[PDB]
Amino acid sequence: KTIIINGVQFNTDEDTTILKFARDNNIDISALCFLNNCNNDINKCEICTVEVEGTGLVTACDTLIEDGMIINTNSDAVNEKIKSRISQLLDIHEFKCGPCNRRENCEFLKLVIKYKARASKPFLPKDKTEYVDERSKSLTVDRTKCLLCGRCVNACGKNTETYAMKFLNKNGKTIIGAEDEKCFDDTNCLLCGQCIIACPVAALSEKSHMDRVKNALNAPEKHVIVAMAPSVRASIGELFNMGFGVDVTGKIYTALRQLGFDKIFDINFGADMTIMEEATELVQRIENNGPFPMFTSCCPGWVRQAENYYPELLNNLSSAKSPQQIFGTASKTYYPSISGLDPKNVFTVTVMPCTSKKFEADRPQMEKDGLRDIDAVITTRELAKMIKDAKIPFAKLEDSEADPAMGEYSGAGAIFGATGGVMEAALRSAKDFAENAELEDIEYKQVRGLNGIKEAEVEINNNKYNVAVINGASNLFKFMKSGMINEKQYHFIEVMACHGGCVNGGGQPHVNPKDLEKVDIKKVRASVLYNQDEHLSKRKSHENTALVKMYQNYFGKPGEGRAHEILHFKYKKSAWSHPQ
Ligand code: SF4
Ligand code: SF4
Ligand code: SF4
Ligand code: SF4
Ligand code: FES
Ligand SMILES: [Mg+2]
Ligand SMILES: [Mg+2]
């Protein structure tokens, strides 16, 4: 093909869109509703408008290049059209960046500045409450910011195939929201927050727990524990202009102390706990030749997916609590026993890459003796905001260490945040347990990486077993609906709702679409975790010295007795009833 763009001739055999071709050749074309290889097919934003001679104005993001095209991306006519569209969006946008939670990384603001757009009539609603939906334990909607770009609807469809995020007709006007404008939690929504990650503006957010946290920190009698997820140490640096793939574990520990938390632990310790219990359960099911398969239960997006779409599998889920909840349980029982704290005064906070974890923490039965396992969950984004509000110079902080009693972790625990991480970690322990051995080959590279569905055959005690790693909620649907689950007997299956695993969770830093083209965010974030695993002396959960002490002195034998009583949680399908 011969293509002319802004007077420059290109000869190409590529079959692609004007936008992609332009961007591959460093020609600037703006875009808004285009993301994840799709745009908003109904009511296109047209921010990607270009001019094609003999055709007129076209949308670059969904128009294929053709031999003979002569394209202008920067004519007066083009720029006036784009400016007009942005002005029209400003007419439905509460343009008050000052207090806005996307102030520092908003795509819309950048477009407004670029084209110097202005509303025809400022959008200034007085009763914001009718634009806001805060009913969910996990998600919140602020429709005064919504551009109706459809990126959330498209991302939900692509990432989960639930289509829980929909366009709705609300009293004659178009909004996005859940089915029948219900609270997301009361629908088939997984609360995974991929819709948030896709949002260019501050219209979708996590349900804030920041006041729970501040209130607890300032309560004189509360002893506030904080523990961060595997993925936080691989990602939060992004929001402090430190770049991608930077391990900031030590800086986080320092920042948390400077924020006034009373104890600095780590959810990776909880991950090693989950493996103790789950590997023990796996070895049990083997020795009892069933039931199979066993599914992981540490992803609450997946648990909701099972609850909402596959209730028949709930009995197959591992009974071990997730690292967050298992940690939380121990923080109200074991931790008082080694500290003297009154359990009622312990307030346990996690920092997560995840919105669905907020729902998990607030499940009514996730408590014992009136004490919540977990009292608050803040996302990576929320912690970043707390750090900046406190004027803590994150990038400049010295490294400190976690408090060890519930802060040590093995390399198995460290890799939980990547797809296949739980699987690999679990196998390292299950194989040692089953064979009564200390095996040296512990790297299961077959279950790593970004393939949607990953399988491996593993040898445990001279019998062969089949494992699968399901990488993304859409791939769970593919795995089940396609009958893949019946090609062979699976014994142990990992499921993560977010593709890439938790490093790509719904509570993570937003990444602007251009950076996403430059950087494989899923692999770069995961690389930090695998690097930790490689350089840790202990690489099996059951070699965690603090964990071993905890079990020896407090819980006893994993998978039975006190451990089973306290550290496990079973989900139940509803009993048959009519009408349904
Ligand atoms: S969403 Fe963006 S443009 Fe709108 S108020 Fe917030 S920062 Fe400003
Ligand atoms: S939280 Fe996940 S399942 Fe629910 S609407 Fe958003 S993307 Fe869809
Ligand atoms: S909530 Fe965000 S992604 Fe969804 S339509 Fe509104 S602005 Fe677009
Ligand atoms: S994959 Fe991780 S971040 Fe995503 S829903 Fe599951 S637990 Fe949350
Ligand atoms: S970016 Fe092309 S129509 Fe929206
Ligand atoms: Mg399209
Ligand atoms: Mg305090």
Coordinates of C-alpha atoms and ligand atoms in Angstrom, one line a residue:
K1 CA 0.0 0.0 0.0
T2 CA 1.0 3.6 -0.6
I3 CA -0.2 5.9 2.3
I4 CA 0.5 9.6 2.6
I5 CA 0.2 11.0 6.1
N6 CA 0.8 14.8 6.6
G7 CA 2.7 14.8 3.3
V8 CA 4.9 11.8 4.1
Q9 CA 4.8 8.8 1.9
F10 CA 4.7 5.3 3.4
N11 CA 4.9 2.0 1.5
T12 CA 3.5 -0.8 3.6
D13 CA 1.9 -4.3 3.5
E14 CA 0.4 -3.8 6.9
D15 CA -3.3 -4.4 7.4
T16 CA -4.1 -2.2 10.4
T17 CA -5.9 1.0 11.4
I18 CA -4.8 4.6 10.7
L19 CA -4.3 5.1 14.4
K20 CA -2.1 2.0 14.9
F21 CA -0.1 2.7 11.8
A22 CA 0.4 6.4 12.8
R23 CA 1.5 5.4 16.3
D24 CA 3.9 2.9 14.9
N25 CA 5.4 5.7 12.8
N26 CA 5.5 8.4 15.5
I27 CA 2.6 10.4 14.1
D28 CA 0.5 11.9 16.8
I29 CA -3.2 11.0 16.8
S30 CA -5.3 11.5 20.0
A31 CA -7.7 8.9 21.2
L32 CA -10.1 8.6 24.1
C33 CA -12.7 5.8 23.8
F34 CA -10.2 3.4 22.0
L35 CA -8.6 0.9 24.4
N36 CA -8.1 -2.9 24.6
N37 CA -8.3 -2.9 20.8
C38 CA -11.9 -1.6 20.6
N39 CA -13.7 1.7 20.7
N40 CA -17.2 2.8 21.6
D41 CA -19.1 1.5 18.6
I42 CA -22.2 3.4 19.6
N43 CA -21.6 7.1 20.1
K44 CA -17.9 7.1 19.1
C45 CA -16.0 9.8 20.8
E46 CA -14.3 10.9 17.5
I47 CA -11.2 12.3 19.4
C48 CA -9.2 10.2 16.8
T49 CA -10.6 12.2 13.9
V50 CA -8.4 12.6 10.9
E51 CA -9.1 13.8 7.4
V52 CA -8.9 11.4 4.4
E53 CA -8.8 13.2 1.0
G54 CA -11.9 12.4 -1.1
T55 CA -13.6 10.9 2.0
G56 CA -13.7 13.6 4.6
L57 CA -13.4 13.2 8.4
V58 CA -12.9 9.6 9.7
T59 CA -12.2 8.0 13.0
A60 CA -8.6 6.8 12.8
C61 CA -9.0 4.2 15.6
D62 CA -11.4 2.0 13.6
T63 CA -10.6 2.9 9.9
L64 CA -8.3 0.5 8.1
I65 CA -5.5 2.0 6.0
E66 CA -6.0 1.5 2.2
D67 CA -3.6 2.0 -0.7
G68 CA -4.0 5.5 -2.0
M69 CA -5.1 7.2 1.2
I70 CA -3.9 10.7 1.7
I71 CA -4.3 11.6 5.4
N72 CA -4.1 14.8 7.4
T73 CA -4.1 14.5 11.2
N74 CA -3.6 18.2 12.1
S75 CA -5.7 20.3 9.7
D76 CA -7.8 23.2 11.1
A77 CA -10.9 21.2 10.3
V78 CA -9.7 18.2 12.2
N79 CA -8.6 20.1 15.2
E80 CA -11.9 22.0 15.3
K81 CA -13.8 18.8 15.3
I82 CA -11.8 17.2 18.1
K83 CA -12.0 20.4 20.1
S84 CA -15.8 20.4 19.6
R85 CA -16.1 16.9 20.9
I86 CA -14.0 17.6 24.0
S87 CA -16.1 20.8 24.7
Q88 CA -19.2 18.7 24.4
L89 CA -17.8 16.3 27.0
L90 CA -16.9 19.2 29.3
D91 CA -20.6 20.1 29.1
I92 CA -21.4 16.9 31.0
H93 CA -18.3 17.0 33.1
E94 CA -17.8 18.4 36.6
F95 CA -14.5 20.0 35.8
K96 CA -13.0 20.4 39.3
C97 CA -9.6 18.8 39.3
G98 CA -8.4 20.2 42.6
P99 CA -10.0 17.6 44.9
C100 CA -10.3 14.9 42.2
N101 CA -8.7 11.5 42.8
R102 CA -7.4 11.4 39.2
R103 CA -5.9 14.9 39.2
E104 CA -2.3 13.7 38.7
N105 CA -3.0 11.2 35.9
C106 CA -6.2 11.9 34.1
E107 CA -6.5 11.3 30.4
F108 CA -9.3 13.7 29.9
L109 CA -7.6 16.6 31.5
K110 CA -4.6 16.0 29.2
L111 CA -7.0 16.2 26.2
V112 CA -8.6 19.3 27.5
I113 CA -5.2 21.0 27.9
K114 CA -4.0 19.8 24.5
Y115 CA -6.9 21.2 22.5
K116 CA -7.6 24.1 24.9
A117 CA -11.2 23.0 25.1
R118 CA -13.9 24.8 27.1
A119 CA -17.4 23.9 28.0
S120 CA -20.2 25.8 26.2
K121 CA -21.9 25.8 29.6
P122 CA -20.1 24.6 32.7
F123 CA -21.5 21.5 34.3
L124 CA -22.1 22.4 37.9
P125 CA -24.6 20.0 39.6
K126 CA -25.6 21.0 43.1
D127 CA -27.0 17.7 44.4
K128 CA -24.1 15.4 43.5
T129 CA -25.7 12.6 45.5
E130 CA -27.9 11.5 42.6
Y131 CA -24.8 11.1 40.4
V132 CA -23.0 9.0 42.9
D133 CA -23.3 5.3 43.8
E134 CA -21.4 4.2 46.9
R135 CA -23.6 1.2 47.8
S136 CA -20.9 -1.3 46.9
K137 CA -18.4 -2.7 49.3
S138 CA -15.8 -2.5 46.5
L139 CA -16.7 -0.1 43.7
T140 CA -18.0 3.5 43.5
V141 CA -19.4 5.4 40.6
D142 CA -19.4 9.2 40.2
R143 CA -21.3 10.0 37.1
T144 CA -20.5 13.7 37.2
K145 CA -17.1 12.6 35.7
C146 CA -18.4 10.0 33.2
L147 CA -17.6 10.5 29.6
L148 CA -19.8 7.6 28.4
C149 CA -16.7 6.4 26.6
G150 CA -17.7 2.7 27.1
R151 CA -14.1 1.7 28.1
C152 CA -15.4 0.1 31.4
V153 CA -18.2 -1.8 29.5
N154 CA -15.7 -3.1 27.0
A155 CA -13.1 -4.0 29.6
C156 CA -15.6 -5.9 31.6
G157 CA -16.7 -7.9 28.6
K158 CA -13.2 -8.6 27.5
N159 CA -11.7 -9.3 30.9
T160 CA -14.6 -11.3 32.6
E161 CA -17.2 -11.9 29.9
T162 CA -19.8 -11.2 32.6
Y163 CA -20.9 -7.9 31.1
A164 CA -21.8 -6.9 34.6
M165 CA -21.0 -3.3 33.6
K166 CA -23.7 -2.1 31.2
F167 CA -25.1 0.9 29.4
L168 CA -28.4 1.7 31.0
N169 CA -31.3 3.9 30.1
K170 CA -32.1 5.8 33.3
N171 CA -35.2 8.1 32.9
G172 CA -34.4 8.9 29.3
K173 CA -30.7 9.4 29.7
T174 CA -27.7 7.1 29.2
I175 CA -25.6 6.0 32.1
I176 CA -23.3 3.1 32.9
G177 CA -23.9 0.8 35.8
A178 CA -24.9 -2.6 37.0
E179 CA -27.9 -4.7 35.8
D180 CA -31.2 -2.8 36.5
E181 CA -29.1 -0.1 38.2
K182 CA -28.6 -2.5 41.2
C183 CA -25.7 -2.3 43.6
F184 CA -22.9 -4.1 41.8
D185 CA -22.5 -6.5 44.7
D186 CA -26.1 -7.8 44.2
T187 CA -25.4 -8.7 40.6
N188 CA -23.1 -11.3 38.9
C189 CA -20.3 -8.7 39.1
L190 CA -17.0 -10.1 40.4
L191 CA -15.9 -6.8 42.0
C192 CA -12.6 -7.3 40.2
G193 CA -12.3 -3.6 39.3
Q194 CA -11.1 -4.0 35.7
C195 CA -13.7 -1.4 34.8
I196 CA -11.9 1.0 37.1
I197 CA -8.5 0.2 35.5
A198 CA -10.0 1.0 32.1
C199 CA -11.6 4.3 33.2
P200 CA -9.8 7.4 31.7
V201 CA -11.3 9.7 34.5
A202 CA -12.4 9.6 38.1
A203 CA -15.9 8.2 37.3
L204 CA -15.1 4.7 38.6
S205 CA -13.2 4.3 41.9
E206 CA -12.6 1.9 44.7
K207 CA -14.9 2.1 47.7
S208 CA -12.8 4.1 50.1
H209 CA -11.5 2.6 53.4
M210 CA -9.2 5.5 54.1
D211 CA -11.4 7.0 56.9
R212 CA -11.6 3.5 58.6
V213 CA -7.8 3.6 58.6
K214 CA -7.3 7.2 59.7
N215 CA -9.9 6.8 62.5
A216 CA -8.2 3.7 63.8
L217 CA -4.7 5.3 63.6
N218 CA -5.9 8.2 65.7
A219 CA -7.9 6.1 68.2
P220 CA -5.7 6.1 71.2
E221 CA -6.4 2.5 72.3
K222 CA -6.2 0.9 68.8
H223 CA -3.1 -1.0 67.8
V224 CA -3.1 -0.8 64.0
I225 CA -1.4 -3.6 62.1
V226 CA -0.7 -3.1 58.4
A227 CA 0.3 -5.7 55.9
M228 CA 0.8 -5.3 52.2
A229 CA 0.0 -7.7 49.3
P230 CA 2.7 -9.3 47.2
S231 CA 1.9 -7.0 44.3
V232 CA 2.1 -3.6 46.1
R233 CA 5.9 -3.7 46.4
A234 CA 6.1 -4.2 42.6
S235 CA 3.8 -1.4 41.5
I236 CA 3.3 1.5 43.9
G237 CA 6.5 3.2 42.8
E238 CA 4.7 4.0 39.5
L239 CA 2.7 6.7 41.3
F240 CA 5.8 8.4 42.6
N241 CA 7.4 8.8 39.1
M242 CA 9.9 6.0 39.8
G243 CA 9.1 4.1 36.6
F244 CA 8.0 0.5 36.1
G245 CA 9.2 -2.7 37.6
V246 CA 10.9 -1.1 40.6
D247 CA 11.1 -3.1 43.9
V248 CA 10.1 -0.6 46.6
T249 CA 9.5 -3.0 49.5
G250 CA 11.8 -1.3 51.9
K251 CA 10.5 2.2 51.1
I252 CA 6.9 1.0 51.8
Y253 CA 7.8 -0.3 55.2
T254 CA 9.4 3.1 56.1
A255 CA 6.4 5.0 54.7
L256 CA 4.0 2.9 56.7
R257 CA 5.9 3.6 59.9
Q258 CA 5.9 7.3 59.1
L259 CA 2.1 7.1 58.6
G260 CA 1.9 5.9 62.2
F261 CA 1.0 2.3 61.9
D262 CA 1.8 0.4 65.0
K263 CA 3.1 -2.8 63.5
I264 CA 4.4 -3.6 60.1
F265 CA 3.7 -7.1 58.9
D266 CA 3.3 -8.6 55.4
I267 CA 0.6 -10.5 53.6
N268 CA 3.3 -12.6 52.0
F269 CA 3.5 -14.2 55.5
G270 CA -0.2 -15.0 55.1
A271 CA 0.6 -16.4 51.7
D272 CA 3.0 -18.9 53.3
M273 CA 0.2 -19.7 55.8
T274 CA -2.3 -20.4 53.0
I275 CA 0.2 -22.7 51.4
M276 CA 0.8 -24.6 54.6
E277 CA -3.0 -25.3 54.8
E278 CA -3.6 -25.7 51.1
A279 CA -0.6 -27.9 50.3
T280 CA -1.6 -30.1 53.3
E281 CA -5.2 -30.3 51.9
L282 CA -3.9 -31.2 48.5
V283 CA -1.8 -34.0 49.9
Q284 CA -4.9 -35.2 51.9
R285 CA -7.1 -35.2 48.8
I286 CA -4.5 -37.2 47.0
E287 CA -4.1 -39.8 49.7
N288 CA -7.9 -40.0 49.8
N289 CA -8.0 -40.2 46.0
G290 CA -10.3 -37.2 45.9
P291 CA -12.3 -35.2 45.7
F292 CA -10.9 -33.6 42.5
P293 CA -10.3 -31.1 41.2
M294 CA -9.3 -28.9 44.1
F295 CA -9.6 -25.2 43.1
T296 CA -7.7 -22.3 44.8
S297 CA -9.9 -20.0 46.8
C298 CA -7.6 -17.0 47.5
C299 CA -9.0 -14.8 44.7
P300 CA -12.3 -13.3 45.8
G301 CA -13.2 -12.3 42.2
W302 CA -13.0 -16.1 41.3
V303 CA -15.0 -17.0 44.5
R304 CA -17.7 -14.6 43.3
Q305 CA -17.5 -16.1 39.8
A306 CA -18.0 -19.6 41.3
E307 CA -20.8 -18.4 43.6
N308 CA -22.6 -16.6 40.7
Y309 CA -22.0 -19.0 37.8
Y310 CA -20.6 -22.3 39.1
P311 CA -22.1 -23.0 42.5
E312 CA -21.5 -26.7 42.0
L313 CA -17.7 -26.1 42.3
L314 CA -17.9 -24.4 45.7
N315 CA -17.4 -27.7 47.5
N316 CA -14.3 -28.2 45.4
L317 CA -12.6 -25.0 46.6
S318 CA -9.8 -25.3 49.0
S319 CA -11.0 -24.5 52.5
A320 CA -7.8 -22.6 53.4
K321 CA -8.6 -18.9 53.9
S322 CA -6.9 -16.5 51.5
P323 CA -3.6 -14.9 52.6
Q324 CA -5.5 -11.8 53.6
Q325 CA -8.1 -13.5 55.6
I326 CA -5.9 -16.2 57.1
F327 CA -3.4 -13.5 58.1
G328 CA -6.3 -11.5 59.6
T329 CA -7.5 -14.4 61.6
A330 CA -4.0 -15.0 63.1
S331 CA -3.7 -11.3 63.8
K332 CA -6.6 -11.5 66.3
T333 CA -5.5 -14.8 67.9
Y334 CA -1.8 -15.6 67.5
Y335 CA -0.6 -12.1 67.6
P336 CA -2.2 -11.1 70.9
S337 CA -0.7 -14.3 72.3
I338 CA 2.9 -13.1 71.5
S339 CA 2.3 -9.4 72.2
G340 CA 0.0 -9.0 75.2
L341 CA -2.4 -6.8 73.2
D342 CA -6.1 -7.1 74.0
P343 CA -7.5 -8.7 70.8
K344 CA -10.4 -6.2 70.7
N345 CA -7.9 -3.4 70.4
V346 CA -6.1 -4.9 67.4
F347 CA -7.2 -3.2 64.1
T348 CA -5.9 -5.0 61.0
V349 CA -5.4 -3.2 57.8
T350 CA -4.2 -4.6 54.4
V351 CA -2.9 -2.9 51.4
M352 CA -4.1 -4.7 48.3
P353 CA -3.9 -4.4 44.5
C354 CA -7.5 -5.4 44.5
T355 CA -11.0 -4.0 45.0
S356 CA -12.7 -7.4 45.5
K357 CA -10.6 -7.9 48.7
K358 CA -12.8 -5.2 50.3
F359 CA -15.8 -7.4 49.7
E360 CA -14.0 -10.5 51.1
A361 CA -12.9 -8.6 54.2
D362 CA -16.5 -7.5 54.9
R363 CA -18.1 -11.0 54.5
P364 CA -20.3 -11.4 57.6
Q365 CA -18.7 -14.7 58.7
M366 CA -15.1 -13.5 58.3
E367 CA -14.8 -13.0 62.0
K368 CA -14.5 -14.9 65.3
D369 CA -15.7 -14.0 68.8
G370 CA -16.9 -10.6 67.4
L371 CA -13.5 -9.7 66.0
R372 CA -13.2 -9.2 62.2
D373 CA -10.3 -11.0 60.6
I374 CA -9.6 -7.8 58.6
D375 CA -10.9 -4.4 59.6
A376 CA -9.9 -2.3 56.6
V377 CA -8.5 -2.8 53.1
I378 CA -6.9 0.0 51.1
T379 CA -5.8 -0.3 47.5
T380 CA -2.4 0.5 46.2
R381 CA -3.9 3.8 44.9
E382 CA -5.3 4.6 48.4
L383 CA -2.0 4.0 50.1
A384 CA -0.2 6.2 47.5
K385 CA -2.8 9.0 48.3
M386 CA -2.2 8.6 52.0
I387 CA 1.5 8.8 51.6
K388 CA 1.3 12.0 49.4
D389 CA -1.3 13.6 51.7
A390 CA 1.2 13.1 54.6
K391 CA 3.9 14.7 52.5
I392 CA 6.1 11.7 52.8
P393 CA 9.0 11.8 50.3
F394 CA 8.6 8.2 49.1
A395 CA 11.2 8.0 46.4
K396 CA 13.8 9.4 48.9
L397 CA 13.1 7.1 51.9
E398 CA 15.6 4.7 53.4
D399 CA 14.8 1.0 53.4
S400 CA 13.5 -0.5 56.6
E401 CA 12.4 -4.0 57.5
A402 CA 9.1 -5.6 58.5
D403 CA 8.4 -6.7 62.0
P404 CA 9.4 -10.4 61.7
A405 CA 6.8 -12.4 63.7
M406 CA 4.1 -12.1 61.0
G407 CA 6.3 -10.3 58.4
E408 CA 8.9 -12.9 57.2
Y409 CA 8.1 -14.5 53.9
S410 CA 9.5 -17.2 51.6
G411 CA 10.0 -16.9 47.9
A412 CA 7.0 -19.1 47.4
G413 CA 4.8 -16.5 49.2
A414 CA 6.5 -13.7 47.2
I415 CA 5.3 -14.9 43.8
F416 CA 1.6 -15.1 44.8
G417 CA 0.9 -11.9 42.9
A418 CA 1.6 -13.4 39.5
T419 CA -0.6 -15.8 37.6
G420 CA 0.7 -19.3 38.3
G421 CA 2.3 -18.1 41.5
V422 CA -0.1 -19.8 43.9
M423 CA 0.2 -23.0 41.8
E424 CA 4.0 -23.0 41.9
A425 CA 4.2 -22.1 45.6
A426 CA 1.7 -24.8 46.5
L427 CA 3.5 -27.5 44.5
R428 CA 6.8 -26.7 46.2
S429 CA 5.2 -27.6 49.5
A430 CA 2.9 -30.3 48.4
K431 CA 5.7 -32.3 46.8
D432 CA 7.9 -32.0 49.9
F433 CA 4.9 -33.0 52.1
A434 CA 3.8 -35.9 50.0
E435 CA 7.3 -37.4 49.5
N436 CA 8.6 -36.5 53.0
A437 CA 11.5 -34.8 51.3
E438 CA 13.4 -31.6 50.8
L439 CA 13.5 -31.5 47.0
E440 CA 15.9 -29.1 45.2
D441 CA 14.2 -28.6 41.9
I442 CA 11.4 -26.1 42.8
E443 CA 10.9 -24.0 39.7
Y444 CA 7.7 -24.7 37.8
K445 CA 8.2 -22.5 34.8
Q446 CA 5.4 -24.3 32.9
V447 CA 2.7 -22.6 34.9
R448 CA 4.1 -19.1 34.6
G449 CA 3.4 -16.4 32.1
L450 CA 0.5 -14.7 30.3
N451 CA -1.1 -17.6 28.4
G452 CA -4.8 -17.6 29.3
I453 CA -5.0 -21.3 30.2
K454 CA -1.9 -23.2 31.3
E455 CA -1.6 -26.8 32.2
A456 CA 1.2 -29.1 33.4
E457 CA 1.6 -32.7 34.4
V458 CA 3.4 -33.1 37.7
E459 CA 4.9 -36.1 39.5
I460 CA 4.1 -36.4 43.2
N461 CA 5.2 -39.5 44.9
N462 CA 5.6 -41.5 41.7
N463 CA 2.0 -40.8 40.5
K464 CA 1.2 -38.3 37.8
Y465 CA -1.2 -35.4 38.5
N466 CA -2.7 -32.8 36.2
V467 CA -2.8 -29.1 37.2
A468 CA -4.2 -26.1 35.4
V469 CA -3.7 -22.4 35.9
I470 CA -6.6 -20.2 34.7
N471 CA -5.4 -16.7 34.0
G472 CA -8.4 -14.3 34.0
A473 CA -12.1 -14.6 34.6
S474 CA -12.9 -14.8 30.9
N475 CA -10.6 -17.8 30.7
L476 CA -12.4 -19.6 33.5
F477 CA -15.6 -19.3 31.4
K478 CA -13.6 -20.6 28.3
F479 CA -12.2 -23.4 30.3
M480 CA -15.6 -24.5 31.6
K481 CA -17.9 -23.8 28.7
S482 CA -15.6 -25.4 26.2
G483 CA -15.5 -28.6 28.2
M484 CA -11.8 -28.4 28.6
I485 CA -12.3 -29.4 32.2
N486 CA -13.3 -32.8 30.9
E487 CA -10.4 -33.6 28.5
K488 CA -8.7 -35.1 31.5
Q489 CA -8.9 -35.5 35.3
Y490 CA -7.6 -32.3 36.9
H491 CA -6.4 -32.5 40.5
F492 CA -5.5 -28.9 41.3
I493 CA -6.6 -25.8 39.6
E494 CA -5.5 -22.1 40.2
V495 CA -7.9 -19.4 39.2
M496 CA -7.2 -15.7 39.2
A497 CA -9.9 -13.3 38.0
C498 CA -7.5 -10.6 36.7
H499 CA -5.4 -11.5 33.7
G500 CA -1.7 -11.5 34.8
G501 CA -2.8 -12.2 38.3
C502 CA -2.9 -9.7 41.1
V503 CA -0.2 -7.5 39.7
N504 CA -2.9 -6.5 37.3
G505 CA -5.6 -6.0 39.9
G506 CA -8.4 -3.5 40.0
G507 CA -6.8 -1.5 42.8
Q508 CA -3.5 -0.9 41.0
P509 CA -2.1 2.3 39.6
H510 CA -3.7 3.4 36.4
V511 CA -1.3 3.2 33.4
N512 CA -2.0 5.5 30.5
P513 CA -2.7 3.7 27.1
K514 CA 0.6 5.0 25.5
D515 CA 2.7 3.6 28.3
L516 CA 0.8 0.4 28.0
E517 CA 2.0 0.1 24.4
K518 CA 5.6 0.6 25.5
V519 CA 5.6 -1.5 28.7
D520 CA 4.2 -5.0 29.3
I521 CA 2.8 -4.0 32.7
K522 CA 1.8 -7.6 33.7
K523 CA 5.3 -9.0 33.1
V524 CA 7.2 -6.1 34.4
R525 CA 5.3 -6.0 37.7
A526 CA 5.5 -9.8 38.0
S527 CA 9.3 -9.7 37.3
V528 CA 9.8 -7.9 40.7
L529 CA 8.2 -10.8 42.5
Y530 CA 10.1 -13.6 40.7
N531 CA 13.3 -11.7 41.3
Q532 CA 12.6 -11.7 45.1
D533 CA 11.9 -15.4 45.0
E534 CA 15.2 -16.1 43.2
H535 CA 17.2 -14.1 45.8
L536 CA 15.5 -15.3 49.0
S537 CA 17.2 -18.0 51.1
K538 CA 13.9 -19.6 51.9
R539 CA 11.9 -20.5 48.8
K540 CA 9.3 -22.9 50.3
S541 CA 6.4 -21.6 52.5
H542 CA 7.0 -24.3 55.1
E543 CA 10.6 -23.1 55.6
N544 CA 9.4 -19.7 56.8
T545 CA 11.0 -19.6 60.3
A546 CA 8.5 -17.3 61.8
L547 CA 5.6 -19.3 60.4
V548 CA 7.1 -22.5 61.7
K549 CA 7.3 -21.0 65.2
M550 CA 3.7 -19.8 65.0
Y551 CA 2.5 -23.3 64.1
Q552 CA 4.7 -25.1 66.7
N553 CA 3.8 -22.7 69.5
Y554 CA 0.1 -21.9 68.7
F555 CA -1.8 -23.6 65.9
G556 CA -0.3 -27.1 65.9
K557 CA -0.5 -29.3 62.9
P558 CA -1.7 -27.7 59.7
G559 CA -4.9 -28.9 58.2
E560 CA -6.3 -30.3 61.4
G561 CA -7.3 -29.4 64.9
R562 CA -7.0 -25.8 65.8
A563 CA -5.6 -24.9 62.4
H564 CA -8.5 -26.3 60.6
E565 CA -11.0 -24.9 63.1
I566 CA -9.7 -21.3 62.8
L567 CA -7.8 -20.9 59.5
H568 CA -10.4 -22.3 57.1
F569 CA -13.6 -21.1 55.5
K570 CA -16.0 -23.1 53.3
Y571 CA -18.4 -21.6 50.8
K572 CA -21.8 -23.3 50.4
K573 CA -24.2 -23.3 47.4
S574 CA -27.8 -22.4 48.2
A575 CA -30.1 -25.4 48.8
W576 CA -32.6 -26.3 46.1
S577 CA -35.8 -24.1 46.3
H578 CA -38.8 -23.1 44.2
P579 CA -39.4 -20.7 42.8
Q580 CA -35.7 -20.0 42.0
Ligands
SF4_1 S1 -11.8 13.4 36.0 FE1 -10.0 14.5 35.2 S2 -10.7 16.3 34.1 FE2 -12.4 15.5 35.4 S3 -12.2 16.7 37.4 FE3 -11.0 14.8 37.7 S4 -8.9 15.3 37.0 FE4 -10.2 17.0 36.2
SF4_2 S1 -15.9 -5.2 38.8 FE1 -15.2 -6.7 37.2 S2 -17.1 -7.9 36.8 FE2 -17.8 -6.1 37.9 S3 -18.4 -4.6 36.4 FE3 -16.2 -4.2 36.9 S4 -15.0 -5.4 35.3 FE4 -17.1 -6.2 35.3
SF4_3 S1 -17.2 5.1 33.9 FE1 -15.2 5.7 33.0 S2 -14.8 4.1 31.4 FE2 -17.0 3.9 32.0 S3 -18.0 5.1 30.4 FE3 -17.7 6.5 32.2 S4 -15.8 7.6 31.8 FE4 -15.9 5.8 30.3
SF4_4 S1 -6.7 -11.7 40.6 FE1 -5.9 -10.7 42.6 S2 -6.4 -8.6 42.2 FE2 -7.7 -9.7 40.7 S3 -9.7 -10.1 41.8 FE3 -8.3 -11.9 42.2 S4 -7.4 -11.4 44.2 FE4 -8.1 -9.5 43.3
FES5 S1 -10.9 7.0 20.0 FE1 -11.7 6.6 18.0 S2 -13.8 7.0 18.1 FE2 -13.1 7.1 20.2
MG6 MG -15.3 -0.3 17.0
MG7 MG -2.5 5.2 66.7

